[PDB]
């Protein structure tokens, strides 16, 4: 056919190695431009200064870190909002001063990242399967949106946005309960159930079916040569590890249907982790954890502490100390 | 299937209401009195909303001594009155 | 201050119009 | 034949409604007091005595602020009997002075032995292997490293976790300022086990419902399942096509993959409470010495660990008069560290 | 800087028209099944 | 505040808002009533 | 054995978990743990 | 009962609405009942707003979102937003709770009395989803119908009182709109602006004629492609890029709407305009500029020269330059310099804050303004405790500001998960896999393997 | 008019509430329909003169 036409069956192909499709067409170059700049400036960015206070903070190895204590800094607190691309800067050493990497990487993640789940429903068309699989990862992107855009436009500023490193991470968590109190935020805990549950069952799922593999090997191999790639029967016997499991707690308790099981498992862990997402997102606009400040008080009118005052007072550390040099007056509101 | 008389049956049937409405209401009522009455306070030792501090003290009543721990909590009981 | 029987007649009103129509067999 | 053991262990192990089992001699009591305990100490009891906190709904906390706190540091790692010799038999002082604490924590811990010796009993009764009482050892691990090591290596059962929601973000912050602890290796693979665990949770789930033959003709698909059918009711290597081409590779083996989501939270797990016991004994991955080195000499040299470090001292110093009542700390308002402004 | 700028315009405007017309490129037809 | 004359029915405007809510749960009265068919 | 349709003991109990939940979100605001 | 259980319908009573898509009569019951409890929600809260409203606090100290909306329009408020006649507010909701009585009676008689079907009763409200045209004729009724609504705030604005204008010069205040802004280089020239900071999209729209303007384009737009709508069908390209069915119309809506909430979430955080800070609080942005002038201010009467008072970091304490030069509040509040409000512009000069009017021309009420929008930042938690998470308990408050920008992102959130979620259902549907994988066709069988 | 305008709205409020449940009550059931519906047509009639009466009577007692 036309060059469009044999051009649009490779990039649509069911054949390619790696599947490529119209989303691929933007997830491809977005990602590789996103991870080449992000490994380029975690080796050998100089100091930025995320603050806004001409207080450069050192993220890249070749300038004093090491793997823990590295990040790809965040953009400067004098940049805020505005959309910074190398071209706005006069030289690639004023566009490096000011953090101009960090907006790079995240906007181009972000945009591969939106293209690789809708890669996932393409490609499950293509392949005539059902098409939710996107919508579980919808979870984790949209964790990446809250802490990379969201909480950045509700603070006004990209500097507010999570650092591109594991030391950075821990940054935006402390300063984020102090100014926030997520921990007691329902939708936190939500989160929290969300992955330990997703874990609890995780494991409990891997530990049943594993429990119940059908003998088809001897002591001296590995049980996993049982199964074969793409045999008919099932490896495992359901009944069995639902006789078991029914008995550990009570028969009702239990899945005897494989689908409702398996649907339990996508929706508990994707549900919490939703949550999650839409706690960093709505505490962007600064509607915050629940805050029992002095909620008990005696019959004088004594505060009696509770835990959570208790928790005030460490909030309270986290406030006075964060960006030290960055506050002229009382109140921090943004 | 495993031999007890079904949940379902239990909770639609005339008898286990005729039985139930009157339990449940009465151990409700009978948690409320324990509140109300003040009882619940004295068993558990927790203090009343007047109770917390002296009319003039301001320092909380911390055990400091694990082995007469129970004759300082009496000392400072003793205080409040 | 007597807004929990206001609570009370439109609470029940739901479920009355279920039972009704329970009881007489109707088109639930 | 059959003596009265036998006849007994025929009683222990008929299959009724809630199974008993002998290892239900040990579990049932213990799981039921430990419960009924914080149940009854987070509804009634203070800690007035021990923290210096109200800590039930009888004092006006509510669900997230309750909680049935630690013994005073004072008491040391006292048992904290009923009948020793702190209470000496009575139940009121031995509610004030946190005898629920050890109460909950001592009957969860054969609680936690007895469930995992059910989970044995079981799985030999109707003959599977015990892998679940196996992936359970990680639960046990981190209720044992957390609740009694952590603090019989510190000076008290005070510096355990209390039993309660906010008492627990409390340790958490402790942790944070005191020790350092999201710079611990031991508790970063502990994260990604129970990160990874979801995941896998998450993506299996997922790909199941999504790779489903159409085994019936309704639009919603649960019924089109038979628990004693022999076929498989997802396309493994449809599974298998989907993933190797959107992420590279993928599973080909089902048997390895439910044994991969058993080890990835489990090891996890584990790792955490190795960390854990670790700062029983203030052992901490608190410092990288080589940042410490530079930043000492050169006042111009951040990073984002030493901004962390200036949190973890604000912590330590505005939590620390009422979070440590024992040791009657009185910090001037003028030796308080803080930033400016603020 | 300005022929930066001109370069990653028209590099970003030829990779969208290609998610554009691809996706134009009678894509419900794209599957195993029924093509329509 | 109301006009005056409405004023009696202040305690049924503090429950108003509420009642699209009720229709949600109503629907799984209706449900159980039919045994979730 | 079943005189009482199951839907019926549905609804009304939990009616009574959503007045109980209720006051208890009712003491938040009033006497103790109101911060008042 | 008709297509009322699984077995009929092929779909569980979780999925029961479902069973509605080719039953037009109960369907447009469904709908017309919902769009009942929404009126209902609109009147019977306006009716909680007003019992609950204490004319003389700021309607942002009191949990207002609807009386706030009525304000804006001109409805009820005066000079600086003050509350001069309840009754409007009385009407608005008086009106929309008995017309969702009428609402609701037709969709209860549709949903469970009238036709289940309309295509035996009616040619013209009956319709196949699959007929294209019928679907952009009835497409073509709806915006018709949005388009008037446009132009009913046209009318508002320009003939029956007006709109309430923050920007008012003297002060904030209810003024008629008369020459509305119809230069398309102007109105559409919004929709061109970068989305980002000191552009802000159509979020920026900061004057009256330019948003009323803005509504008599929609207006005539909407009109147009209604009538173009309802006599075209659509063309070849378009039938071969979607998929034409119930389900996929659903889910091209939720795209919409979730895109639409986003929008919204943006225009009531950043937006002072239409969303007057009279009636909806101080902007996130506007409360921190308000702190850094409380400041200045109080300091500057103490004698501070705050245009030379350098800051412990080298930047200025109180003034400073943003990174293209104009003079802006310094501190943490240099991130909000894009901020404009009426309060704080007769300080800005050609080069930003102007010194000497800061020296010599602050007016007390400009000194009130900022101390009020400060000590009302959107800032709180979720009990509603006013201010910073470390705050003691005192102060009721949640600024409306947060609670809409937060409802309204969990919305469109969702809505987007709603659309992924029916979108790649109706392409599955549609291709005939939504069921699971034919086992004696699988696709992936035949195809090569990958290695 | 006070005495009439409590009492037309008191009245409206009564007819609201036995509307909401009859109406669906009756579209439902499968007996005495044609009843029914000559009720719900006089009940439907009798609701839209009585919002009128007090939105009428609203300005006389204001
Ligand atoms: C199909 C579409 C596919 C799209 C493909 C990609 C196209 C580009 C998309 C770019 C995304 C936006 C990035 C920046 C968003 C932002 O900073 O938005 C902020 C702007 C508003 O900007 C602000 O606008 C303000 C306007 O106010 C000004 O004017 C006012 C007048 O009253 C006041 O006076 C005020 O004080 C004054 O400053 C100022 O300019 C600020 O400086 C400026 O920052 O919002 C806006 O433009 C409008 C709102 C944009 C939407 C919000 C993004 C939500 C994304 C969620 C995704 C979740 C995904 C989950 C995955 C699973
Ligand atoms: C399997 C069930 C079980 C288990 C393992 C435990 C375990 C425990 N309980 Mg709990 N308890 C239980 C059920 C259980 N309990 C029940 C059913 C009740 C309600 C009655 C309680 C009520 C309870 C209270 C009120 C308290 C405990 C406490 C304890 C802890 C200390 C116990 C101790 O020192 O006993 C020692 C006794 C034995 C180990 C028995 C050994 C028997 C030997 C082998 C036989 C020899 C007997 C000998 C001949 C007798 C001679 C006496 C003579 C010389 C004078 C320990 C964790 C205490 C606690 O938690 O402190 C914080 C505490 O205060 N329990
Ligand atoms: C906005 C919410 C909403 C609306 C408008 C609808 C509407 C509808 N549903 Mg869905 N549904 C919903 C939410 C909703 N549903 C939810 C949350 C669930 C999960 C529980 C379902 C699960 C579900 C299933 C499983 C089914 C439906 C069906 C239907 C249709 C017929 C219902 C019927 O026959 O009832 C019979 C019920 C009665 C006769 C009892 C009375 C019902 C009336 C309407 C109550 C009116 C009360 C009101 C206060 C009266 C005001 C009167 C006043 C104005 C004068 C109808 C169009 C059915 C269908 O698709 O038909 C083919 C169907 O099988 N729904
Ligand atoms: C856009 C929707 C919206 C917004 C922004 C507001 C905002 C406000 N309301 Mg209003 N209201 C609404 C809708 C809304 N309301 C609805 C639907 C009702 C009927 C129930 C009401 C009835 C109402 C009353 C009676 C009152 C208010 C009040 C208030 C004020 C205080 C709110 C508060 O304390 O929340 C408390 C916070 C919560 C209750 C948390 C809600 C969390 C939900 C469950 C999360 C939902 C997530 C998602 C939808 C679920 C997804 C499930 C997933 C699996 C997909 C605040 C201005 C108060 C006020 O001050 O009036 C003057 C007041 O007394 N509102
Ligand atoms: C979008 C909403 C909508 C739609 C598409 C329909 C459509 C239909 N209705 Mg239903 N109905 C509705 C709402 C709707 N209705 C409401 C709100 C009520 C309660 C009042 C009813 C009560 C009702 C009854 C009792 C009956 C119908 C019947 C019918 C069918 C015959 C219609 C006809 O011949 O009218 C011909 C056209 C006219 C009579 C012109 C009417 C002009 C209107 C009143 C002015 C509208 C102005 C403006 C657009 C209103 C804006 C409203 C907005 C602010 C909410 C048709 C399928 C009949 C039926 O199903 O047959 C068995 C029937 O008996 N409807
Ligand atoms: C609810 C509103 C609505 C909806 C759902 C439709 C739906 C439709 N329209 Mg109609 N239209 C409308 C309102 C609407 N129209 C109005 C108000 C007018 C007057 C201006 C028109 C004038 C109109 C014409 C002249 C035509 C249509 C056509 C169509 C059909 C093809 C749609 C399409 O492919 O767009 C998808 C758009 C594209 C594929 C263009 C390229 C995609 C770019 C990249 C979009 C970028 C948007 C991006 C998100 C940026 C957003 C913000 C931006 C302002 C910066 C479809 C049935 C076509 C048809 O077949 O007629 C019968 C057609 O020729 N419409
Ligand atoms: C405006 C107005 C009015 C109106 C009214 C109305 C409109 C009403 C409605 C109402 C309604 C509409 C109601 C409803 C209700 C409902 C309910 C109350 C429900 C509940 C439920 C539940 C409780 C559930 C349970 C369950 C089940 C059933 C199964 C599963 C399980 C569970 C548990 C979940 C009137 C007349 C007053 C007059 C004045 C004015
Ligand atoms: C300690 C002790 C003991 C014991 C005791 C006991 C054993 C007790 C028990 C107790 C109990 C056993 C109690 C219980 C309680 C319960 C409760 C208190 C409950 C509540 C609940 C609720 C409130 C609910 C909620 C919810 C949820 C959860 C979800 C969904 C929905 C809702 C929200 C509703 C003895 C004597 C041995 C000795 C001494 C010491
Ligand atoms: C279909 C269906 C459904 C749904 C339904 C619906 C959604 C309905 C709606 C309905 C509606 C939507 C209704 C409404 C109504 C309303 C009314 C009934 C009102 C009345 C009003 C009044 C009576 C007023 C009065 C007053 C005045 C005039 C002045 C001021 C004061 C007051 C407020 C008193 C469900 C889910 C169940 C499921 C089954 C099926
Ligand atoms: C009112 C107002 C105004 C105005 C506004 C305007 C004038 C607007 C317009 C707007 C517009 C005018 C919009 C548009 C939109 C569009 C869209 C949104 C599109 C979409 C598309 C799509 C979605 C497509 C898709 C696809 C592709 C891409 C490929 C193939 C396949 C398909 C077809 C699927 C202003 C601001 C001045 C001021 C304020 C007020
Ligand atoms: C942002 C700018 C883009 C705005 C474009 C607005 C759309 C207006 C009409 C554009 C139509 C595009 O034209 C589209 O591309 C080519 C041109 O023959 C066609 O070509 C396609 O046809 C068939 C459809 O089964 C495909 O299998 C084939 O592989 C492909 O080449 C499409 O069928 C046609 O619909
Ligand atoms: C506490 C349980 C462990 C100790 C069990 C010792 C059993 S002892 C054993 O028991 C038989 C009956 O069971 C008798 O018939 C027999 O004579 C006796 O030796
Ligand atoms: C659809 C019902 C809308 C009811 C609108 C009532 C008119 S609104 C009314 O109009 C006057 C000019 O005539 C204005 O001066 C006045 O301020 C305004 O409130
Ligand atoms: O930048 Mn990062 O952190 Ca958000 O709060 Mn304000 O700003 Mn800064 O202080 Mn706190
Ligand atoms: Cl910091
Ligand atoms: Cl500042
Ligand atoms: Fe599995
Ligand atoms: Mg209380």
């Given at each position: 056919?036309?060059?469009?036409?044999?051009?649009?069956?490779?990039?649509?192909?069911?054949?390619?190695?790696?599947?490529?499709?119209?989303?691929?067409?933007?997830?491809?170059?977005?990602?590789?431009?996103?991870?080449?700049?992000?490994?380029?400036?975690?080796?050998?960015?100089?100091?930025?200064?995320?603050?806004?206070?001409?207080?450069?903070?050192?993220?890249?190895?070749?300038?004093?870190?090491?793997?823990?204590?590295?990040?790809?800094?965040?953009?400067?607190?004098?940049?805020?909002?505005?959309?910074?691309?190398?071209?706005?800067?006069?030289?690639?050493?004023?566009?490096?001063?000011?953090?101009?990497?960090?907006?790079?990487?995240?906007?181009?993640?972000?945009?591969?990242?939106?293209?690789?789940?809708?890669?996932?429903?393409?490609?499950?068309?293509?392949?005539?399967?059902?098409?939710?699989?996107?919508?579980?990862?919808?979870?984790?992107?949209?964790?990446?949106?809250?802490?990379?855009?969201?909480?950045?436009?509700?603070?006004?500023?990209?500097?507010?946005?999570?650092?591109?490193?594991?030391?950075?991470?821990?940054?935006?968590?402390?300063?984020?309960?102090?100014?926030?109190?997520?921990?007691?935020?329902?939708?936190?805990?939500?989160?929290?159930?969300?992955?330990?549950?997703?874990?609890?069952?995780?494991?409990?799922?891997?530990?049943?079916?594993?429990?119940?593999?059908?003998?088809?090997?001897?002591?001296?191999?590995?049980?996993?040569?049982?199964?074969?790639?793409?045999?008919?029967?099932?490896?495992?016997?359901?009944?069995?590890?639902?006789?078991?499991?029914?008995?550990?707690?009570?028969?009702?308790?239990?899945?005897?249907?494989?689908?409702?099981?398996?649907?339990?498992?996508?929706?508990?862990?994707?549900?919490?982790?939703?949550?999650?997402?839409?706690?960093?997102?709505?505490?962007?606009?600064?509607?915050?954890?629940?805050?029992?400040?002095?909620?008990?008080?005696?019959?004088?009118?004594?505060?009696?502490?509770?835990?959570?005052?208790?928790?005030?007072?460490?909030?309270?550390?986290?406030?006075?100390?964060?960006?030290?040099?960055?506050?002229?007056?009382?109140?921090?509101?943004? | 299937?495993?031999?007890?008389?079904?949940?379902?049956?239990?909770?639609?049937?005339?008898?286990?209401?005729?039985?139930?409405?009157?339990?449940?209401?009465?151990?409700?009522?009978?948690?409320?009195?324990?509140?109300?009455?003040?009882?619940?306070?004295?068993?558990?030792?927790?203090?009343?909303?007047?109770?917390?501090?002296?009319?003039?003290?301001?320092?909380?009543?911390?055990?400091?001594?694990?082995?007469?721990?129970?004759?300082?909590?009496?000392?400072?009981?003793?205080?409040?009155? | 201050?007597?807004?929990?029987?206001?609570?009370?007649?439109?609470?029940?009103?739901?479920?009355?119009?279920?039972?009704?129509?329970?009881?007489?067999?109707?088109?639930? | 034949?059959?003596?009265?053991?036998?006849?007994?262990?025929?009683?222990?192990?008929?299959?009724?409604?809630?199974?008993?089992?002998?290892?239900?001699?040990?579990?049932?009591?213990?799981?039921?007091?430990?419960?009924?305990?914080?149940?009854?100490?987070?509804?009634?009891?203070?800690?007035?005595?021990?923290?210096?906190?109200?800590?039930?709904?009888?004092?006006?906390?509510?669900?997230?602020?309750?909680?049935?706190?630690?013994?005073?540091?004072?008491?040391?790692?006292?048992?904290?009997?009923?009948?020793?010799?702190?209470?000496?038999?009575?139940?009121?002082?031995?509610?004030?002075?946190?005898?629920?604490?050890?109460?909950?924590?001592?009957?969860?811990?054969?609680?936690?032995?007895?469930?995992?010796?059910?989970?044995?009993?079981?799985?030999?009764?109707?003959?599977?292997?015990?892998?679940?009482?196996?992936?359970?050892?990680?639960?046990?691990?981190?209720?044992?490293?957390?609740?009694?090591?952590?603090?019989?290596?510190?000076?008290?059962?005070?510096?355990?976790?209390?039993?309660?929601?906010?008492?627990?973000?409390?340790?958490?912050?402790?942790?944070?300022?005191?020790?350092?602890?999201?710079?611990?290796?031991?508790?970063?693979?502990?994260?990604?086990?129970?990160?990874?665990?979801?995941?896998?949770?998450?993506?299996?789930?997922?790909?199941?419902?999504?790779?489903?033959?159409?085994?019936?003709?309704?639009?919603?698909?649960?019924?089109?399942?038979?628990?004693?059918?022999?076929?498989?009711?997802?396309?493994?290597?449809?599974?298998?096509?989907?993933?190797?081409?959107?992420?590279?590779?993928?599973?080909?083996?089902?048997?390895?993959?439910?044994?991969?989501?058993?080890?990835?939270?489990?090891?996890?797990?584990?790792?955490?409470?190795?960390?854990?016991?670790?700062?029983?004994?203030?052992?901490?991955?608190?410092?990288?010495?080589?940042?410490?080195?530079?930043?000492?000499?050169?006042?111009?040299?951040?990073?984002?660990?030493?901004?962390?470090?200036?949190?973890?001292?604000?912590?330590?110093?505005?939590?620390?008069?009422?979070?440590?009542?024992?040791?009657?700390?009185?910090?001037?308002?003028?030796?308080?560290?803080?930033?400016?402004?603020? | 800087?300005?022929?930066?700028?001109?370069?990653?315009?028209?590099?970003?405007?030829?990779?969208?028209?290609?998610?554009?017309?691809?996706?134009?490129?009678?894509?419900?037809?794209?599957?195993?099944?029924?093509?329509? | 505040?109301?006009?005056?004359?409405?004023?009696?029915?202040?305690?049924?405007?503090?429950?108003?808002?509420?009642?699209?809510?009720?229709?949600?749960?109503?629907?799984?009265?209706?449900?159980?009533?039919?045994?979730?068919? | 054995?079943?005189?009482?349709?199951?839907?019926?003991?549905?609804?009304?109990?939990?009616?009574?978990?959503?007045?109980?939940?209720?006051?208890?979100?009712?003491?938040?605001?009033?006497?103790?743990?109101?911060?008042? | 009962?008709?297509?009322?259980?699984?077995?009929?319908?092929?779909?569980?009573?979780?999925?029961?609405?479902?069973?509605?898509?080719?039953?037009?009569?109960?369907?447009?019951?469904?709908?017309?009942?919902?769009?009942?409890?929404?009126?209902?929600?609109?009147?019977?809260?306006?009716?909680?707003?007003?019992?609950?409203?204490?004319?003389?606090?700021?309607?942002?100290?009191?949990?207002?979102?609807?009386?706030?909306?009525?304000?804006?329009?001109?409805?009820?408020?005066?000079?600086?937003?003050?509350?001069?006649?309840?009754?409007?507010?009385?009407?608005?909701?008086?009106?929309?709770?008995?017309?969702?009585?009428?609402?609701?009676?037709?969709?209860?008689?549709?949903?469970?009395?009238?036709?289940?079907?309309?295509?035996?009763?009616?040619?013209?409200?009956?319709?196949?989803?699959?007929?294209?045209?019928?679907?952009?004729?009835?497409?073509?009724?709806?915006?018709?119908?949005?388009?008037?609504?446009?132009?009913?705030?046209?009318?508002?604005?320009?003939?029956?009182?007006?709109?309430?204008?923050?920007?008012?010069?003297?002060?904030?205040?209810?003024?008629?709109?008369?020459?509305?802004?119809?230069?398309?280089?102007?109105?559409?020239?919004?929709?061109?602006?970068?989305?980002?900071?000191?552009?802000?999209?159509?979020?920026?729209?900061?004057?009256?004629?330019?948003?009323?303007?803005?509504?008599?384009?929609?207006?005539?737009?909407?009109?147009?492609?209604?009538?173009?709508?309802?006599?075209?069908?659509?063309?070849?390209?378009?039938?071969?890029?979607?998929?034409?069915?119930?389900?996929?119309?659903?889910?091209?809506?939720?795209?919409?709407?979730?895109?639409?909430?986003?929008?919204?979430?943006?225009?009531?955080?950043?937006?002072?305009?239409?969303?007057?800070?009279?009636?909806?609080?101080?902007?996130?942005?506007?409360?921190?500029?308000?702190?850094?002038?409380?400041?200045?201010?109080?300091?500057?009467?103490?004698?501070?020269?705050?245009?030379?008072?350098?800051?412990?970091?080298?930047?200025?304490?109180?003034?400073?330059?943003?990174?293209?030069?104009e003079i802006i509040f310094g501190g943490e509040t240099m991130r909000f310099w894009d901020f404009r409000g009426p309060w704080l512009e007769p300080l800005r000069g050609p080069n930003g804050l102007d010194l000497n009017k800061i020296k010599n021309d602050i007016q007390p009420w400009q000194e009130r303004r900022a101390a009020e929008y400060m000590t009302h930042a959107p800032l709180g938690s979720l009990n509603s405790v006013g201010g910073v998470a470390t705050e003691i308990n005192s102060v009721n408050f949640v600024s409306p500001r947060s609670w809409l920008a937060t409802s309204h992102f969990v919305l469109a959130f969702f809505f987007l998960v709603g659309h992924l979620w029916h979108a790649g259902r109706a392409r599955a549907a549609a291709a005939g896999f939504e069921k699971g994988i034919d086992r004696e066709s699988e696709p992936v069988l035949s195809m090569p393997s990958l290695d | 008019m006070t005495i009439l305008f409590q009492l037309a709205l008191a009245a409206l409020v009564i007819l609201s509430f036995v509307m909401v449940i009859g109406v669906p009550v009756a579209y439902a059931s499968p007996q005495d329909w044609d009843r029914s519906k000559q009720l719900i047509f006089l009940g439907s009639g009798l609701w839209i003169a009585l919002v009128l009466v007090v939105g009428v009577l609203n300005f006389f007692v204001v």
């Amino acid at each position: 056919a036309n060059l469009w036409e044999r051009f649009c069956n490779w990039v649509t192909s069911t054949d390619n190695r790696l599947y490529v499709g119209w989303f691929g067409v933007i997830m491809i170059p977005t990602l590789l431009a996103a991870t080449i700049c992000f490994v380029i400036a975690f080796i050998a960015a100089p100091p930025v200064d995320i603050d806004g206070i001409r207080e450069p903070v050192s993220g890249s190895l070749l300038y004093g870190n090491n793997i823990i204590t590295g990040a790809v800094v965040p953009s400067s607190n004098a940049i805020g909002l505005h959309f910074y691309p190398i071209w706005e800067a006069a030289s690639l050493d004023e566009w490096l001063y000011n953090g101009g990497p960090y907006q790079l990487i995240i906007f181009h993640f972000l945009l591969g990242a939106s293209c690789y789940m809708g890669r996932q429903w393409e490609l499950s068309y293509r392949l005539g399967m059902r098409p939710w699989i996107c919508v579980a990862y919808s979870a984790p992107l949209a964790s990446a949106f809250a802490v990379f855009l969201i909480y950045p436009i509700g603070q006004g500023s990209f500097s507010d946005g999570m650092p591109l490193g594991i030391s950075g991470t821990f940054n935006f968590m402390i300063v984020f309960q102090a100014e926030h109190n997520i921990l007691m935020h329902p939708f936190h805990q939500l989160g929290v159930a969300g992955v330990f549950g997703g874990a609890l069952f995780c494991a409990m799922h891997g530990s049943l079916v594993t429990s119940s593999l059908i003998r088809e090997t001897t002591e001296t191999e590995s049980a996993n040569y049982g199964y074969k790639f793409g045999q008919e029967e099932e490896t495992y016997n359901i009944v069995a590890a639902h006789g078991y499991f029914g008995r550990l707690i009570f028969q009702y308790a239990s899945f005897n249907n494989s689908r409702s099981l398996h649907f339990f498992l996508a929706a508990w862990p994707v549900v919490g982790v939703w949550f999650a997402a839409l706690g960093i997102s709505t505490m962007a606009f600064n509607l915050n954890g629940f805050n029992f400040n002095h909620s008990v008080i005696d019959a004088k009118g004594n505060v009696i502490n509770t835990w959570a005052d208790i928790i005030n007072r460490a909030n309270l550390g986290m406030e006075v100390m964060h960006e030290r040099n960055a506050h002229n007056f009382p109140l921090d509101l943004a | 299937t495993t031999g007890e008389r079904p949940f379902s049956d239990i909770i639609t049937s005339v008898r286990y209401w005729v039985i139930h409405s009157i339990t449940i209401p009465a151990l409700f009522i009978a948690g409320w009195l324990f509140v109300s009455t003040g009882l619940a306070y004295d068993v558990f030792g927790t203090p009343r909303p007047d109770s917390y501090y002296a009319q003039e003290q301001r320092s909380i009543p911390l055990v400091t001594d694990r082995f007469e721990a129970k004759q300082q909590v009496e000392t400072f009981l003793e205080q409040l009155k | 201050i007597a807004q929990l029987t206001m609570i009370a007649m439109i609470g029940i009103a739901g479920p009355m119009i279920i039972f009704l129509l329970a009881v007489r067999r109707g088109n639930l | 034949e059959r003596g009265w053991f036998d006849i007994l262990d025929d009683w222990l192990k008929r299959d009724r409604f809630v199974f008993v089992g002998w290892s239900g001699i040990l579990l049932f009591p213990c799981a039921y007091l430990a419960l009924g305990g914080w149940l009854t100490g987070t509804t009634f009891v203070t800690s007035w005595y021990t923290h210096g906190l109200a800590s039930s709904y009888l004092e006006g906390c509510n669900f997230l602020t309750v909680a049935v706190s630690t013994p005073a540091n004072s008491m040391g790692h006292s048992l904290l009997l009923l009948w020793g010799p702190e209470a000496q038999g009575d139940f009121t002082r031995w509610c004030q002075l946190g005898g629920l604490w050890t109460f909950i924590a001592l009957h969860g811990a054969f609680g936690l032995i007895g469930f995992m010796l059910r989970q044995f009993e079981i799985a030999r009764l109707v003959g599977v292997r015990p892998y679940n009482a196996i992936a359970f050892s990680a639960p046990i691990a981190v209720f044992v490293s957390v609740f009694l090591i952590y603090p019989l290596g510190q000076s008290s059962w005070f510096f355990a976790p209390s039993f309660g929601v906010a008492a627990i973000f409390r340790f958490l912050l402790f942790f944070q300022g005191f020790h350092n602890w999201t710079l611990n290796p031991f508790h970063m693979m502990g994260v990604a086990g129970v990160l990874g665990g979801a995941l896998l949770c998450a993506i299996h789930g997922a790909t199941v419902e999504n790779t489903l033959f159409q085994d019936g003709e309704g639009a919603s698909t649960f019924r089109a399942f038979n628990p004693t059918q022999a076929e498989e009711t997802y396309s493994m290597v449809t599974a298998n096509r989907f993933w190797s081409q959107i992420f590279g590779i993928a599973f080909s083996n089902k048997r390895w993959l439910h044994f991969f989501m058993l080890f990835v939270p489990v090891t996890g797990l584990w790792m955490s409470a190795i960390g854990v016991v670790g700062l029983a004994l203030n052992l901490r991955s608190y410092d990288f010495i080589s940042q410490e080195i530079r930043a000492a000499e050169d006042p111009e040299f951040e990073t984002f660990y030493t901004k962390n470090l200036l949190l973890n001292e604000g912590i330590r110093a505005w939590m620390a008069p009422q979070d440590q009542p024992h040791e009657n700390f009185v910090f001037p308002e003028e030796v308080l560290p803080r930033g400016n402004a603020l | 800087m300005e022929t930066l700028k001109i370069t990653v315009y028209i590099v970003v405007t030829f990779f969208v028209l290609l998610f554009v017309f691809g996706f134009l490129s009678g894509d419900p037809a794209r599957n195993p099944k029924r093509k329509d | 505040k109301l006009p005056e004359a409405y004023a009696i029915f202040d305690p049924l405007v503090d429950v108003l808002p509420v009642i699209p809510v009720l229709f949600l749960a109503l629907a799984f009265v209706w449900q159980a009533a039919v045994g979730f068919r | 054995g079943g005189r009482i349709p199951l839907w019926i003991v549905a609804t009304v109990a939990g009616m009574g978990v959503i007045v109980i939940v209720g006051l208890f979100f009712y003491g938040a605001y009033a006497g103790l743990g109101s911060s008042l | 009962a008709t297509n009322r259980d699984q077995e009929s319908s092929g779909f569980a009573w979780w999925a029961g609405n479902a069973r509605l898509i080719n039953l037009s009569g109960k369907l447009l019951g469904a709908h017309v009942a919902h769009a009942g409890l929404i009126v209902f929600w609109a009147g019977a809260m306006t009716l909680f707003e007003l019992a609950h409203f204490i004319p003389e606090k700021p309607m942002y100290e009191q949990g207002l979102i609807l009386i706030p909306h009525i304000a804006t329009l001109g409805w009820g408020v005066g000079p600086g937003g003050e509350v001069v006649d309840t009754f409007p507010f009385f009407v608005v909701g008086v009106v929309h709770l008995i017309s969702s009585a009428v609402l609701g009676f037709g969709g209860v008689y549709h949903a469970i009395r009238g036709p289940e079907t309309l295509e035996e009763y009616s040619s013209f409200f009956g319709y196949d989803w699959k007929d294209k045209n019928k679907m952009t004729t009835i497409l073509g009724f709806h915006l018709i119908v949005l388009g008037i609504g446009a132009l009913l705030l046209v009318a508002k604005a320009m003939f029956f009182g007006g709109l309430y204008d923050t920007w008012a010069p003297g002060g904030g205040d209810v003024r008629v709109i008369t020459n509305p802004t119809l230069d398309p280089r102007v109105i559409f020239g919004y929709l061109l602006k970068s989305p980002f900071g000191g552009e802000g999209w159509i979020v920026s729209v900061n004057n009256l004629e330019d948003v009323v303007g803005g509504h008599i384009w929609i207006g005539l737009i909407c009109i147009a492609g209604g009538i173009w709508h309802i006599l075209t069908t659509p063309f070849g390209w378009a039938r071969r890029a979607f998929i034409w069915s119930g389900e996929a119309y659903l889910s091209y809506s939720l795209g919409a709407l979730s895109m639409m909430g986003f929008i919204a979430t943006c225009f009531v955080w950043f937006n002072n305009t239409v969303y007057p800070s009279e009636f909806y609080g101080p902007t996130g942005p506007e409360a921190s500029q308000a702190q850094a002038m409380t400041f200045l201010i109080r300091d500057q009467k103490l004698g501070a020269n705050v245009g030379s008072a350098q800051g412990p970091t080298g930047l200025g304490k109180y003034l400073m330059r943003s990174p293209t030069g104009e003079i802006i509040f310094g501190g943490e509040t240099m991130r909000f310099w894009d901020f404009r409000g009426p309060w704080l512009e007769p300080l800005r000069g050609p080069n930003g804050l102007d010194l000497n009017k800061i020296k010599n021309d602050i007016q007390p009420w400009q000194e009130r303004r900022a101390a009020e929008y400060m000590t009302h930042a959107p800032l709180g938690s979720l009990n509603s405790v006013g201010g910073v998470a470390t705050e003691i308990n005192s102060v009721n408050f949640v600024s409306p500001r947060s609670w809409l920008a937060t409802s309204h992102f969990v919305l469109a959130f969702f809505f987007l998960v709603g659309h992924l979620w029916h979108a790649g259902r109706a392409r599955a549907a549609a291709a005939g896999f939504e069921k699971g994988i034919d086992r004696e066709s699988e696709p992936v069988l035949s195809m090569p393997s990958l290695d | 008019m006070t005495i009439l305008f409590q009492l037309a709205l008191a009245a409206l409020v009564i007819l609201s509430f036995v509307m909401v449940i009859g109406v669906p009550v009756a579209y439902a059931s499968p007996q005495d329909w044609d009843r029914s519906k000559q009720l719900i047509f006089l009940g439907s009639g009798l609701w839209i003169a009585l919002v009128l009466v007090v939105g009428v009577l609203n300005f006389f007692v204001v």
